Amino acid sequence: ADELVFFVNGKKVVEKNADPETTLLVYLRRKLGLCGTKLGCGEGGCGACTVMISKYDRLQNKIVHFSVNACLAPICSLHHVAVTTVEGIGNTQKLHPVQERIARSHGSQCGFCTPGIVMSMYTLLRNQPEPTVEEIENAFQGNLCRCTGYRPILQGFRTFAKDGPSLFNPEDFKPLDPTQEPIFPPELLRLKDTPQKKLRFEGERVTWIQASTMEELLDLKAQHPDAKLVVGNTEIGIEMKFKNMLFPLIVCPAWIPELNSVVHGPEGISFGASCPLSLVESVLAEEIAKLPEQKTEVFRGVMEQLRWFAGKQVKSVASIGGNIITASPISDLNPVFMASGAKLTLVSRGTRRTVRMDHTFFPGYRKTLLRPEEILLSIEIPYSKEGEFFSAFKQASRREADIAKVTSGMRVLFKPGTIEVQELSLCFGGMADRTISALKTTPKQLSKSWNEELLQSVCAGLAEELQLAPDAPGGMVEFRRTLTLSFFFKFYLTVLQKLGRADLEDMCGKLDPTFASATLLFQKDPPANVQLFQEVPKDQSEEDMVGRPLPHLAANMQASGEAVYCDDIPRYENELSLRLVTSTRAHAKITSIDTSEAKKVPGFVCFLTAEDVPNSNATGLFNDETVFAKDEVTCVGHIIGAVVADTPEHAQRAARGVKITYEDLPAIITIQDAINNNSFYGSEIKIEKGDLKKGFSEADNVVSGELYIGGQEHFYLETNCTIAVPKGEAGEMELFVSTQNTMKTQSFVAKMLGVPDNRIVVRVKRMGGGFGGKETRSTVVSTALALAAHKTGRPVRCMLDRDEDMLITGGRHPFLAKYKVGFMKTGTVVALEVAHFSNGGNTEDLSRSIMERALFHMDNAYKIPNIRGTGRICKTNLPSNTAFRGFGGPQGMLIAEYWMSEVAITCGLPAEEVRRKNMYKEGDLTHFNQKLEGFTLPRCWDECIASSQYLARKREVEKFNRENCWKKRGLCIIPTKFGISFTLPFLNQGGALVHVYTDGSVLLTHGGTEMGQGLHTKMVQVASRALKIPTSKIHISETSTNTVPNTSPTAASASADLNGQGVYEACQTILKRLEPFKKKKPTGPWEAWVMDAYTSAVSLSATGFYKTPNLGYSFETNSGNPFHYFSYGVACSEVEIDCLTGDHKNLRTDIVMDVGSSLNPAIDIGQVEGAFVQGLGLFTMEELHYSPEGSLHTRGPSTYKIPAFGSIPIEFRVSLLRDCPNKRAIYASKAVGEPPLFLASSIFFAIKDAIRAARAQHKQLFQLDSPATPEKIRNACVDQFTTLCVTCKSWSVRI
Ligand SMILES: Cc1cc2nc3c(=O)[nH]c(=O)nc-3n(C[C@H](O)[C@H](O)[C@H](O)COP(=O)(O)OP(=O)(O)OC[C@H]3O[C@@H](n4cnc5c(N)ncnc54)[C@H](O)[C@@H]3O)c2cc1C
Ligand SMILES: O=c1[nH]c(=O)c2[nH]c(=O)[nH]c2[nH]1
Ligand code: FES
Ligand code: FES
């Protein structure tokens, strides 16, 4: 047959013409209109596309449920399954407990990840209605969230756990009733009786065969060796989508019973090749639990690899054979299967052979010794024998859901009753183009005794055998080499212990108890979290929600997937799709463009270039950017043109048929390239105070050095998206955009078209994250699309894929700092000179303002009487860098804390003492001459140091450190000051419009956009207090250029301060109009006043506006206030590093934050944790790599590792400072968005201390660049392993 039949949320689907290249995500969203399930990445990393599958399993004879990534599930694999999406478990009329709890617990901010997390938690509960805390965290390994910091999500779902004033009340949560879950489609139960027959699906390019029997599979492969096997599609899905490979014949064997069997034999367990590795997990788990330790050494090796193997979504469908035959050089399983010589059985039509995975199974890049007509039937995973021990290792950039840098299986077999080596196997991933054995090192150790000589021998061997070319793909050559020695050392120590417990301690020797911690398998304690905030007064009306923890107004709809993001908006019947075509060279003239292949693609409409621009090709904030490339491209990812087509699939294919010819031009990539070439955005910026010559002469000590700070991708989970709708009259156009900047979107589209602004309407409902990345760079999509719509007279839409978004839109500015600080022996700093260099990319954008903010913050919290800061903004052939939460502040303040760390240690005084005595006091002037009034930072400091019990913890850390050789702890307390207001004064303005309808209901709008920070929630809270009506009677629908004009972007943490005042004033005007009707009827209700004013013909509409008074700094005169006030905060953080791998635990973080009198402590704490965890990523995890030719390598969650559920401080405590009203801002609040982010430097400097301790154990003022990744941490822990590894064309360059 050829009809595809499955169910979605209980509703039957018959697809008569199923295309093999159609993903379930595309089918749900575009074909069925169910847009709760989101696209976040397309590569199986983010889990925003998570849905549940149910089916009758023919083999275990029961209904089963598991989770999948819809983005990677082919609909042609889903015959006779039942899909459940977020829409199928509940809605706002009747939320499922999962939805209720994530929403009420403040677990949904921007809302974009909330459906996929719901669906992960939902699936766990359908499998296990009483899970453990462990099982709950484990459920979300495949789910990323960029806003919340994860804490509230876990805290809310802890209420489900078997073994489980305040922000929420878990006792109002309605109970789970599993009888109320949706029926498994009866029809699917009826069909379980019928045998499965072979299916054939035919699309544009691809034919899919679903083989029902092994005979059919082997026949097909005999007659057509070229048929591509697809099982989980977790590899092929990626090959097709990201490496533009096309397999025109696919066969899916997933149904075949022989490929799904589990047979327990004498030598081990044999898994069918199509067994999902989730089934491998459950089988080996049960086996490990019931069998003796002695014979489950290999099994435990596999389970250890599978712990750190993606998450539940991938492992549900990913097959064991899948991973083997893919032959990735970084398989986590193949090293283990090889090290254990696992038995693989192969078959074709009328042949069958068995072999042991050794080095010959993997001959070359991505090849196996399988013949083209042959398929893998099964892998036996062996029982271990007496005197046989195994370890598995993996080090990445992040523990969870990451791809190996180095990964290994290691096996030793001892001659019986001995410590003499019979067999040894050391196999590695990530060290060559294939899984390799250390064949030249292993044989030398035969019959040797397991001792310090074998340990040194093997290490010398691995050092010589596992060479890396400096060009070697992936880089990190020293770290990768070190890792192989380090893993073997752990194996060595582990074997000693295992010998020990076999009663041969007398022969091999005891383990020094300070080495024991080396061999321990990763374990985390259960989390503990604390949230402290201030109750509102006794007096305050229960209808006055200002200061109360009101949940985000859209939380319920976000958990239900009813909240509408831009691409969720239904398509017009005549709507077209746009796809950007981008430069693949950093600097080069465009010689020619050939659209000849692009036109052959069915659906192609046109290719837009500079020539099609009606009016101006000059755009960007400083008018120095092209809408489309004209003559030369100036970065890899420079936008050249845009394809327009009927569908996105057709737009993408057509876009591949635009062939461009280039002629290269001198490229300027790095900060150094830029310095050498004097290529800069404008002149040097400078702040200078006191006498620098004097200060340095007086200083007992002077320290000099450099610090590099890597950039950051925003990874808003909703990428950039615009729909442009042309109106056909007078140049009128309406845009629906995920942007923080409606005004610039409007202006840029207007100018590009050559029509006045009054013709262009930009509408923003909400964004799934912004973080500064949608302050300006959203417009490169908006303009291309506006043009397509103008040209065609048709609606046009573009949502960027994650790879596109990451390449085109740029990030946080990398900084290079050169510093010279002079101080006394007491720790007091008397002179500071710091040169700052940013890499700004190929347009000015916000770069100059960012450098200004960095300089405004080079003091951090410290009075420095003699100080000189300069910044220079490099102009390079890279994507233009832009605003990222902090806007140069974090960069500024890290440099300050870096040299401050070096002062502390040069003086041999405690860090905290040196910091405290250097701290400004109330009434002081900054280096830019602004008075610090209401300086709460000391209170923040004294509270945090006391509540975190900093001094006692110091002692515990010191103790751990001298009792452990290969693990070390560090502890650091970091303050911050953050200035509040746009560096550009006139941007400190906002507007509101309010209407009161005759039913008494209020429709409010202001210039701010909602991106998950809870701005609308806050403004509703404000309006409610202002008008003295319940929040229930006030609504905000959207943000729009034709309701409030000339709005500043939603940025600089300012948007609640500005819009809050606007809203307030709009409400004051209304109240003034209602006054006389209130006097006549003081008790009669709101509705009566309103209807009275209407029937007396009094206006019930009003604008409101606010400007921040008394702002304006001058760099000429070093006078005037840049800031309206300052945010202040302090964080104490503890880490434990692994000295042999570079991995670390974030053990505990304590934050005290001054948000004034919080408008909303639930949102404010959320913003603290969110900001903090972004900082955490910036300073420890998140790293962007570029080729020396300036091509971003790092384009997806696979290779760009943001903080995961497992990344957050195990113990995470946030307190909002009590009794600190900030009268100048709306209802005595303070901004909160950005200031907390820098406090994650506490973890950077805590890692610093741990490294220092590791160095003393095995050069002072050692270098630690940001981000402090595994690579840097491990490389800085110099030891006998690094020293034997350490000593051109290369994969990447430091930009
Ligand atoms: C988000 C994400 C995270 C990942 N993390 C990891 C990780 O941590 N470690 C890791 O090692 N891998 C990882 N992978 C890779 C992938 O998940 C595994 O390699 C997986 O086992 C592939 O199995 P599959 O069934 O999806 O293979 P498919 O993609 O269906 O097929 C893969 C290849 O195997 C072939 N094939 C499948 N079965 C057979 C058979 N019986 N005989 C012959 N050929 C066959 C196919 O033709 C194809 O060439 C990750 C992938 C994703 C998307
Ligand atoms: O002073 C600022 N100006 C901005 O334009 C901006 N954008 C941002 O994210 N933070 C800041 N800060
Ligand atoms: S969209 Fe499917 S995993 Fe990210
Ligand atoms: S709230 Fe999770 S990505 Fe925004």
PDB file of N, CA, C and O in Angstrom, residues 428-467:
ATOM      1  N   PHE A 428      39.437   4.902  21.653  1.00  0.00           N
ATOM      2  CA  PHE A 428      39.146   6.330  21.786  1.00  0.00           C
ATOM      3  C   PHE A 428      38.308   6.865  20.622  1.00  0.00           C
ATOM      4  O   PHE A 428      38.484   6.500  19.459  1.00  0.00           O
ATOM      5  N   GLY A 429      37.386   7.760  20.984  1.00  0.00           N
ATOM      6  CA  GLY A 429      36.731   8.650  20.070  1.00  0.00           C
ATOM      7  C   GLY A 429      37.323  10.039  20.163  1.00  0.00           C
ATOM      8  O   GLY A 429      37.928  10.398  21.150  1.00  0.00           O
ATOM      9  N   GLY A 430      37.142  10.824  19.107  1.00  0.00           N
ATOM     10  CA  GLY A 430      37.516  12.216  19.117  1.00  0.00           C
ATOM     11  C   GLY A 430      39.012  12.433  18.971  1.00  0.00           C
ATOM     12  O   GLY A 430      39.465  13.583  19.096  1.00  0.00           O
ATOM     13  N   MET A 431      39.774  11.361  18.679  1.00  0.00           N
ATOM     14  CA  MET A 431      41.239  11.450  18.560  1.00  0.00           C
ATOM     15  C   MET A 431      41.726  11.186  17.122  1.00  0.00           C
ATOM     16  O   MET A 431      42.910  11.387  16.819  1.00  0.00           O
ATOM     17  N   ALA A 432      40.819  10.778  16.231  1.00  0.00           N
ATOM     18  CA  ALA A 432      41.155  10.452  14.837  1.00  0.00           C
ATOM     19  C   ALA A 432      39.865  10.468  14.005  1.00  0.00           C
ATOM     20  O   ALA A 432      38.815  10.807  14.532  1.00  0.00           O
ATOM     21  N   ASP A 433      39.939  10.108  12.718  1.00  0.00           N
ATOM     22  CA  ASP A 433      38.788  10.190  11.815  1.00  0.00           C
ATOM     23  C   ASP A 433      37.858   8.991  12.034  1.00  0.00           C
ATOM     24  O   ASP A 433      36.805   8.873  11.393  1.00  0.00           O
ATOM     25  N   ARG A 434      38.254   8.108  12.953  1.00  0.00           N
ATOM     26  CA  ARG A 434      37.518   6.915  13.292  1.00  0.00           C
ATOM     27  C   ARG A 434      37.726   6.606  14.786  1.00  0.00           C
ATOM     28  O   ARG A 434      38.658   7.127  15.435  1.00  0.00           O
ATOM     29  N   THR A 435      36.836   5.773  15.336  1.00  0.00           N
ATOM     30  CA  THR A 435      37.100   5.104  16.593  1.00  0.00           C
ATOM     31  C   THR A 435      38.389   4.279  16.436  1.00  0.00           C
ATOM     32  O   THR A 435      38.447   3.394  15.574  1.00  0.00           O
ATOM     33  N   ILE A 436      39.415   4.567  17.250  1.00  0.00           N
ATOM     34  CA  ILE A 436      40.730   3.877  17.146  1.00  0.00           C
ATOM     35  C   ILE A 436      41.078   3.139  18.449  1.00  0.00           C
ATOM     36  O   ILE A 436      40.654   3.537  19.553  1.00  0.00           O
ATOM     37  N   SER A 437      41.849   2.051  18.278  1.00  0.00           N
ATOM     38  CA  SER A 437      42.524   1.312  19.355  1.00  0.00           C
ATOM     39  C   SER A 437      43.967   1.805  19.452  1.00  0.00           C
ATOM     40  O   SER A 437      44.554   2.174  18.445  1.00  0.00           O
ATOM     41  N   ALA A 438      44.519   1.821  20.666  1.00  0.00           N
ATOM     42  CA  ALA A 438      45.918   2.191  20.874  1.00  0.00           C
ATOM     43  C   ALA A 438      46.780   0.929  20.711  1.00  0.00           C
ATOM     44  O   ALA A 438      47.349   0.412  21.672  1.00  0.00           O
ATOM     45  N   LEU A 439      46.869   0.466  19.461  1.00  0.00           N
ATOM     46  CA  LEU A 439      47.352  -0.878  19.102  1.00  0.00           C
ATOM     47  C   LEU A 439      48.859  -1.003  19.350  1.00  0.00           C
ATOM     48  O   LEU A 439      49.339  -2.115  19.552  1.00  0.00           O
ATOM     49  N   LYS A 440      49.578   0.125  19.270  1.00  0.00           N
ATOM     50  CA  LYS A 440      51.035   0.145  19.340  1.00  0.00           C
ATOM     51  C   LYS A 440      51.514   0.315  20.786  1.00  0.00           C
ATOM     52  O   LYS A 440      52.703   0.155  21.043  1.00  0.00           O
ATOM     53  N   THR A 441      50.595   0.644  21.707  1.00  0.00           N
ATOM     54  CA  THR A 441      50.920   0.935  23.115  1.00  0.00           C
ATOM     55  C   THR A 441      50.531  -0.247  24.018  1.00  0.00           C
ATOM     56  O   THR A 441      51.276  -0.608  24.943  1.00  0.00           O
ATOM     57  N   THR A 442      49.380  -0.853  23.713  1.00  0.00           N
ATOM     58  CA  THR A 442      48.737  -1.918  24.491  1.00  0.00           C
ATOM     59  C   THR A 442      49.601  -3.184  24.556  1.00  0.00           C
ATOM     60  O   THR A 442      49.729  -3.761  25.637  1.00  0.00           O
ATOM     61  N   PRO A 443      50.178  -3.695  23.434  1.00  0.00           N
ATOM     62  CA  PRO A 443      50.857  -5.001  23.435  1.00  0.00           C
ATOM     63  C   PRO A 443      52.130  -5.064  24.305  1.00  0.00           C
ATOM     64  O   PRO A 443      52.488  -6.133  24.821  1.00  0.00           O
ATOM     65  N   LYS A 444      52.782  -3.908  24.479  1.00  0.00           N
ATOM     66  CA  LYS A 444      53.973  -3.740  25.307  1.00  0.00           C
ATOM     67  C   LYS A 444      53.702  -4.042  26.796  1.00  0.00           C
ATOM     68  O   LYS A 444      54.649  -4.316  27.548  1.00  0.00           O
ATOM     69  N   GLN A 445      52.435  -3.965  27.236  1.00  0.00           N
ATOM     70  CA  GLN A 445      52.091  -4.049  28.669  1.00  0.00           C
ATOM     71  C   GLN A 445      51.643  -5.478  29.009  1.00  0.00           C
ATOM     72  O   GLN A 445      51.274  -5.747  30.148  1.00  0.00           O
ATOM     73  N   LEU A 446      51.680  -6.390  28.030  1.00  0.00           N
ATOM     74  CA  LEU A 446      51.312  -7.800  28.252  1.00  0.00           C
ATOM     75  C   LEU A 446      52.284  -8.434  29.259  1.00  0.00           C
ATOM     76  O   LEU A 446      53.506  -8.340  29.106  1.00  0.00           O
ATOM     77  N   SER A 447      51.718  -9.046  30.308  1.00  0.00           N
ATOM     78  CA  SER A 447      52.459  -9.772  31.353  1.00  0.00           C
ATOM     79  C   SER A 447      53.169  -8.820  32.328  1.00  0.00           C
ATOM     80  O   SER A 447      53.781  -9.297  33.285  1.00  0.00           O
ATOM     81  N   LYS A 448      53.073  -7.497  32.119  1.00  0.00           N
ATOM     82  CA  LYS A 448      53.540  -6.518  33.115  1.00  0.00           C
ATOM     83  C   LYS A 448      52.605  -6.539  34.332  1.00  0.00           C
ATOM     84  O   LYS A 448      51.441  -6.941  34.236  1.00  0.00           O
ATOM     85  N   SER A 449      53.122  -6.084  35.475  1.00  0.00           N
ATOM     86  CA  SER A 449      52.315  -5.943  36.679  1.00  0.00           C
ATOM     87  C   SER A 449      51.741  -4.524  36.740  1.00  0.00           C
ATOM     88  O   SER A 449      52.395  -3.557  36.334  1.00  0.00           O
ATOM     89  N   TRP A 450      50.509  -4.438  37.246  1.00  0.00           N
ATOM     90  CA  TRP A 450      49.731  -3.215  37.294  1.00  0.00           C
ATOM     91  C   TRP A 450      50.288  -2.257  38.355  1.00  0.00           C
ATOM     92  O   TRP A 450      49.874  -2.283  39.512  1.00  0.00           O
ATOM     93  N   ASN A 451      51.204  -1.382  37.932  1.00  0.00           N
ATOM     94  CA  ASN A 451      52.009  -0.594  38.857  1.00  0.00           C
ATOM     95  C   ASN A 451      52.456   0.702  38.172  1.00  0.00           C
ATOM     96  O   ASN A 451      52.202   0.909  36.986  1.00  0.00           O
ATOM     97  N   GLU A 452      53.143   1.548  38.943  1.00  0.00           N
ATOM     98  CA  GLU A 452      53.610   2.879  38.535  1.00  0.00           C
ATOM     99  C   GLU A 452      54.406   2.834  37.211  1.00  0.00           C
ATOM    100  O   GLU A 452      54.505   3.845  36.504  1.00  0.00           O
ATOM    101  N   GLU A 453      54.986   1.677  36.867  1.00  0.00           N
ATOM    102  CA  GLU A 453      55.803   1.536  35.647  1.00  0.00           C
ATOM    103  C   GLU A 453      54.892   1.342  34.420  1.00  0.00           C
ATOM    104  O   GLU A 453      55.110   1.954  33.378  1.00  0.00           O
ATOM    105  N   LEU A 454      53.879   0.480  34.545  1.00  0.00           N
ATOM    106  CA  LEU A 454      52.842   0.335  33.524  1.00  0.00           C
ATOM    107  C   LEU A 454      52.169   1.699  33.288  1.00  0.00           C
ATOM    108  O   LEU A 454      51.976   2.106  32.141  1.00  0.00           O
ATOM    109  N   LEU A 455      51.854   2.409  34.380  1.00  0.00           N
ATOM    110  CA  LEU A 455      51.201   3.710  34.317  1.00  0.00           C
ATOM    111  C   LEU A 455      52.034   4.717  33.514  1.00  0.00           C
ATOM    112  O   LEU A 455      51.455   5.510  32.755  1.00  0.00           O
ATOM    113  N   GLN A 456      53.360   4.726  33.735  1.00  0.00           N
ATOM    114  CA  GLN A 456      54.255   5.654  33.046  1.00  0.00           C
ATOM    115  C   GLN A 456      54.452   5.185  31.599  1.00  0.00           C
ATOM    116  O   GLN A 456      54.452   6.006  30.688  1.00  0.00           O
ATOM    117  N   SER A 457      54.618   3.871  31.408  1.00  0.00           N
ATOM    118  CA  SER A 457      54.794   3.252  30.081  1.00  0.00           C
ATOM    119  C   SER A 457      53.610   3.618  29.175  1.00  0.00           C
ATOM    120  O   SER A 457      53.778   4.259  28.116  1.00  0.00           O
ATOM    121  N   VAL A 458      52.406   3.231  29.611  1.00  0.00           N
ATOM    122  CA  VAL A 458      51.189   3.505  28.849  1.00  0.00           C
ATOM    123  C   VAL A 458      51.117   5.002  28.518  1.00  0.00           C
ATOM    124  O   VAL A 458      50.905   5.353  27.376  1.00  0.00           O
ATOM    125  N   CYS A 459      51.334   5.874  29.504  1.00  0.00           N
ATOM    126  CA  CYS A 459      51.246   7.321  29.274  1.00  0.00           C
ATOM    127  C   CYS A 459      52.260   7.770  28.222  1.00  0.00           C
ATOM    128  O   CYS A 459      51.943   8.552  27.358  1.00  0.00           O
ATOM    129  N   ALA A 460      53.496   7.274  28.301  1.00  0.00           N
ATOM    130  CA  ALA A 460      54.492   7.625  27.292  1.00  0.00           C
ATOM    131  C   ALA A 460      53.987   7.162  25.917  1.00  0.00           C
ATOM    132  O   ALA A 460      54.131   7.894  24.933  1.00  0.00           O
ATOM    133  N   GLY A 461      53.386   5.961  25.878  1.00  0.00           N
ATOM    134  CA  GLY A 461      52.884   5.328  24.647  1.00  0.00           C
ATOM    135  C   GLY A 461      51.770   6.132  23.978  1.00  0.00           C
ATOM    136  O   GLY A 461      51.887   6.514  22.812  1.00  0.00           O
ATOM    137  N   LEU A 462      50.703   6.404  24.739  1.00  0.00           N
ATOM    138  CA  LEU A 462      49.542   7.197  24.289  1.00  0.00           C
ATOM    139  C   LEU A 462      49.996   8.588  23.825  1.00  0.00           C
ATOM    140  O   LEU A 462      49.426   9.146  22.889  1.00  0.00           O
ATOM    141  N   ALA A 463      51.009   9.150  24.489  1.00  0.00           N
ATOM    142  CA  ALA A 463      51.510  10.487  24.152  1.00  0.00           C
ATOM    143  C   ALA A 463      52.094  10.513  22.727  1.00  0.00           C
ATOM    144  O   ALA A 463      51.983  11.521  22.036  1.00  0.00           O
ATOM    145  N   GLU A 464      52.714   9.404  22.308  1.00  0.00           N
ATOM    146  CA  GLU A 464      53.408   9.291  21.024  1.00  0.00           C
ATOM    147  C   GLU A 464      52.448   8.770  19.946  1.00  0.00           C
ATOM    148  O   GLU A 464      52.474   9.265  18.826  1.00  0.00           O
ATOM    149  N   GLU A 465      51.631   7.764  20.295  1.00  0.00           N
ATOM    150  CA  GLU A 465      50.700   7.097  19.356  1.00  0.00           C
ATOM    151  C   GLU A 465      49.525   8.017  18.972  1.00  0.00           C
ATOM    152  O   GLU A 465      49.168   8.101  17.794  1.00  0.00           O
ATOM    153  N   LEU A 466      48.926   8.707  19.952  1.00  0.00           N
ATOM    154  CA  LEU A 466      47.721   9.513  19.715  1.00  0.00           C
ATOM    155  C   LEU A 466      48.130  10.959  19.441  1.00  0.00           C
ATOM    156  O   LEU A 466      47.708  11.879  20.148  1.00  0.00           O
ATOM    157  N   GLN A 467      48.946  11.131  18.395  1.00  0.00           N
ATOM    158  CA  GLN A 467      49.378  12.432  17.920  1.00  0.00           C
ATOM    159  C   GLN A 467      48.187  13.166  17.311  1.00  0.00           C
ATOM    160  O   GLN A 467      47.249  12.546  16.817  1.00  0.00           O
TER     161      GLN A 467
END
